[PDB]
Nucleic acid binder design. Structure first.
Length: 627
DNA sequence: CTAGCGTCA
DNA sequence: GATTTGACGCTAG
């Protein structure tokens, strides 16, 4: 009441006094609040509306007394984001003050506790706009218990607020979190927000001491929390896609679809709906009686009917082409706004530490383009080539070479591995027993896959699968005997997992795998394979994340350099650099991402060096190596 | 072999 | 009639 403070109704002395307070504060507890009003605090992470405000509970202790006269203790500041209909002078005043307060919030020296902070920072930048840029949020550190939770038990499906409090609090602190407008009145929503905010504070301190207890603290503070405003930045920009050519690929794919639909009717002898599995089941078995109740339309069955009638193949083809148009063309086109796409990045996304992305999945778009048969000439679909730098600018893309293999060397310690101008060709040529130059990309494509599969515990079965089955047991031993230390490393990770129940990456990231003790043998074996994988891939995720923070701060503070970091494929950062600035940018990126070997500074000493690999180009599809 | 997201029957 | 699963499709090592 005086415990919910609307800065817009503050008089002029106390505006200055309020920012003074935000500086002096021992803690700030923030959350966004939507037009509902709900908060992210939270309702399934879908409050169903655009944003209106930010609520900041200021804990003036967490010396002597403090009484401001304009507030209660501890006050809750209410910062109005929402634009009114028409835009005039005092509103300009108000918004300037809001911008001012929010800026202070980002930069201040005490702990700042926020839940889905990335969301917060992204919203503040939308609001901030041109009035302050994306580097005035890079230093921002704020404590997001969704992340602390995810660090502690990574498996756990990324939780709501409730779940977390009732789990991690002592004792019986609580929330009234349902509150909306129209579900409730004004007072209900706002007093519930202050209460939920004191709650979120305690949830958070408790989670912190948990981290310190599990040795996940240094990991939290140095890798994850600084990564937060970086992800927030990438969401605030968007990559441009080639609209005309995109819509043309949809036109291409569209035809062959209508054409395949036509051939299907003809052979079937009736004009039916080809997308309907029912009618096609009625046709294949109702009418053509191909079985001699009905089996299904699944792809195994239709494959079995390949001979009998010419219906199946046409169907399967319609289906494959339909999958292509939908995922590659129609899906991406659903995502665009203004001819641009920007994925949401999920830091709690996986168990190994890697990030993940939705809408679209930018870590999922295929490397190599694909073929659909163009009917009434030679052309293709490449989905990546539909992502383009705006003009004049060029994508620079920096990438860690064979990073998991390098880590595997650092961990195992293998001499024959360490001894080992592009590495993969060399086993690709030994398989080939050839001179480097004539080995095709597909051979490296199968060779690298061969190595990954064999290092992670793959039986001779799938190894042969990806070729004679007995022949390869032969390959495998050849491989495992070549490098003994890789077997010793796996044996080590596995043994430590049975020993402690979890296993830990280079930087402290943990993967509990309790089924290591599980009596069932396929389960036990899975947990083992998983552990051995995790130490490696978890470590690589740690490294990539570090590289991303360092590189991002390097580009952040430069007077000359304009480069915006745009996206991250797992091992590869991708920047959009202003055109003349590629050589400068490539230089910085190189320098920075290599220098990692010692920035812990030196906790982390890589017995094998990190080589970045730089590429550049106007479109994401065509990027020439540069060197 | 290990991690993800996206499209379906 | 609508709605959620487990295969397989791609991705990254």
């Amino acid at each position: 009441k005086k415990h919910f403070c609307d800065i817009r109704h503050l008089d002029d002395w106390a505006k200055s006094q309020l920012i003074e307070m935000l500086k002096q504060a021992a803690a700030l507890v923030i959350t966004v609040m939507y037009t509902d009003g709900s908060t992210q605090l939270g309702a399934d992470q879908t409050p169903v509306s655009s944003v209106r405000g930010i609520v900041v509970l200021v804990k003036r202790q967490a010396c002597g007394p403090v009484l401001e006269g304009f507030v209660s203790d501890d006050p809750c500041i209410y910062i109005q984001i929402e634009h009114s209909a028409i835009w005039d002078q005092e509103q300009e005043a108000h918004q300037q003050f809001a911008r001012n307060v929010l800026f202070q919030t980002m930069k201040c020296k005490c702990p700042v506790i926020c839940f889905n902070a990335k969301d917060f920072v992204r919203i503040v930048l939308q609001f901030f706009g041109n009035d302050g840029s994306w580097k005035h949020v890079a230093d921002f550190i704020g404590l997001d218990p969704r992340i602390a939770a995810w660090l502690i038990d990574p498996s756990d499906a990324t939780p709501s607020f409730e779940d977390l409090v009732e789990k991690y609090c002592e004792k019986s602190i609580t929330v009234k979190v349902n509150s909306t407008y129209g579900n409730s009145s004004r007072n209900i929503v706002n007093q519930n927000v202050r209460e939920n905010l004191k709650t979120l504070y305690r949830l958070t301190m408790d989670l912190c001491s948990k981290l310190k207890d599990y040795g996940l603290w240094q990991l939290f503070r140095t890798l994850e929390l600084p990564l937060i405003p970086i992800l927030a930045v990438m969401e605030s920009h968007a990559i441009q896609v080639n609209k005309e050519e995109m819509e043309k690929t949809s036109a291409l794919l569209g035809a062959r679809l209508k054409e395949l639909e036509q051939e299907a009717h003809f052979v079937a002898g009736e004009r039916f709906l080809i997308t309907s599995n029912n009618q096609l089941r009625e046709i294949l078995f109702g009418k053509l009686k191909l079985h001699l109740k009905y089996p299904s339309t699944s792809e195994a069955v239709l494959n079995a009917l390949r001979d009998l009638h010419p219906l199946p193949k046409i169907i399967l083809e319609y289906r494959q082409v339909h999958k292509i148009k939908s995922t590659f063309v129609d899906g991406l086109l659903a995502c665009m706004k203004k001819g641009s796409i920007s994925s949401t990045w999920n830091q709690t996304g996986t168990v190994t530490g890697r990030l993940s992305a939705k809408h679209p999945n930018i870590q999922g778009i295929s490397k190599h383009p694909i073929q659909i048969t163009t009917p009434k000439k030679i052309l293709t679909i490449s989905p990546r080539a539909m992502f383009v730098s705006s003009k004049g600018h060029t994508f620079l893309a920096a990438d860690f070479s064979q990073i998991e293999l390098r880590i595997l060397t650092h961990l195992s310690g293998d001499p024959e591995l360490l001894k080992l101008d592009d590495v993969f060709s060399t086993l690709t040529s030994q398989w080939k027993d050839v001179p480097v130059e004539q080995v095709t990309h597909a051979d490296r494509e199968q060779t690298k896959k061969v190595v990954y599969a064999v290092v992670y515990g793959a039986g001779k079965e799938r190894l042969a699968a990806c070729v004679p089955i007995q022949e390869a047991a032969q390959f495998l031993e050849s491989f495992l005997q070549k490098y003994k230390k890789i077997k010793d490393f796996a044996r080590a990770a596995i043994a430590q997992c049975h020993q402690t129940g979890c296993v830990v990456s280079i930087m402290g990231r943990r993967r509990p795998l309790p089924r290591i003790h599980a009596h069932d043998q396929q389960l036990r074996a899975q947990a083992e394979r998983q552990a051995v994988n995790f130490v490696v891939q978890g470590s690589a995720a740690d490294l990539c994340k570090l590289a991303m923070i360092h590189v991002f701060t390097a580009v952040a503070a430069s007077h000359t350099l304009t480069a915006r970091l745009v996206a991250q494929i797992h091992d590869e950062l991708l920047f959009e650099v202003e055109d003349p600035q590629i050589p400068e940018c490539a230089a910085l990126v190189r320098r920075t991402m290599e220098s990692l070997e010692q920035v812990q500074a030196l906790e982390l000493q890589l017995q094998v060096p990190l080589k970045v690999s730089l590429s550049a180009g106007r479109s994401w599809g065509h990027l020439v190596p540069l060197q």
